[PDB]
């Protein structure tokens, strides 16, 4: 993440890393929602322009990693994939509308102090928290290229009003997206795509994934804001899949 | 279906401990005039 700081231990235990098997490559972030399930962006599993059209065997995920460089044995775990589900109306061509996808683990992760899932938002919590000026937290990783090992980073960013979002780009944005980040600094950089934007309920005191990181417009460029897939709008779909396994 | 213990961090919400940046979020939701 650009313009962040060090996360604490087990601060974002639902944080996941989406890796490639061969060659080993950090693709994206993802969010643990249950024992058998992980949530991420559709562009992380399918993007014909960058020549991306993965399958379950191509990929492998690393749960509850504090520091990415190490192999933190008996803290973290590593898991295979059984099936990948991308949104049927995921429009990659035009705007990344419905940039959402689900990955079913081959085996279920057992919850620990460092592995623990996140709540999906419901009609109340969505309308009450998804407001301009209200801030949300994005977790991700600073890439290895330049830079106390590489420990999980974290930033807090304010949701932006819908007509500041529509003026900040030339791209037809739907109601399935919202947008966040400071005005004229911070934007979750490559490696941190498809991971969670969370908010904490002052009412019930749980953590709730409001948005998945869909795109920046560059990693932290003022006047431009990162766009996040509106998880509640598409909440309906997530259920259809997890019911039907 | 539904996860009962979701979003309750085993090392913070369980432990009645607040992190170094979550005050910042709560006090952005305080704008409800
Ligand atoms: C992606 O791969 C699937 C499975 O082989 C194939 O049927 C499909 O044509 C591909 N689609 C795109 C958009 O790359």
Residue numbers in the entry:
A (entry chain B): 16 to 36, 36A, 37 to 60, 60A, 60B, 60C, 60D, 60E, ...
B (entry chain A): 1E, 1D, 1C, 1B, 1A, 1 to 14, 14A, 14B, ...
Sentences from the paper on this structure:
Members of the trypsin family of proteases participate in key physiological processes ranging from blood coagulation to apoptosis. A common theme in the trypsin family is that proteases are synthesized as inactive zymogens and then converted to the active enzyme by cleavage at residue R159 that generates a new N-terminus, typically at residue I16. A new H-bonds then forms with the side chain of residue D194 leading to organization of the primary specificity pocket, the oxyanion hole and other critical epitopes of the active site to enable substrate binding and catalysis. Hence, the I16-D194 ionic interaction contributes to multiple features of the trypsin fold and deserves attention.
The crystal structure of the thrombin mutant D194A was solved in the free form at a resolution of 2.8 Å and final Rfree = 0.29. As expected, the D194A mutation abrogates the critical ionic interaction between the Oδ2 atom of D194 and the amino terminus of I16. The additional H-bond between the Oδ1 atom of D194 and the backbone N atom of G142 is also disrupted, forcing the entire 141–143 segment to undergo a conformational shift of more than 7 Å in the direction of the 70-loop in exosite I. A notable consequence of this shift is the loss of the H-bond between N143 and E192. The structure of D194A is peculiar because loss of the N143–E192 H-bond is not accompanied by disruption of the architecture of the oxyanion hole. A compensatory H-bond with G43 stabilizes the conformation of G193. The new interaction causes the entire 189–195 segment to shift in the direction of the strand housing G43, and by using the C191–C220 disulfide bond as a hinge, the 215–217 segment is pulled into the active site toward D189 in the primary specificity pocket. Notably, the depth of the primary specificity pocket as measured by the distance between the Oγ atom of the catalytic S195 and the Oδ1 atom of D189 shrinks by 1.6 Å. A less extensive perturbation of the Na+ binding site is observed in the structure of the D194A mutant where a significant portion of the electron density of the 186-loop is missing, as in many zymogen structures. The D194A mutant cleaves procoagulant (fibrinogen), prothrombotic (PAR1) and anticoagulant (protein C) substrates with kcat/Km values that are several thousand times slower than those of wild-type. In contrast, the mutant D194A features significantly different rate constants at the reference temperature, especially koff, that translate in an equilibrium dissociation constant for FPR binding of 4.9 ± 0.5 μM.
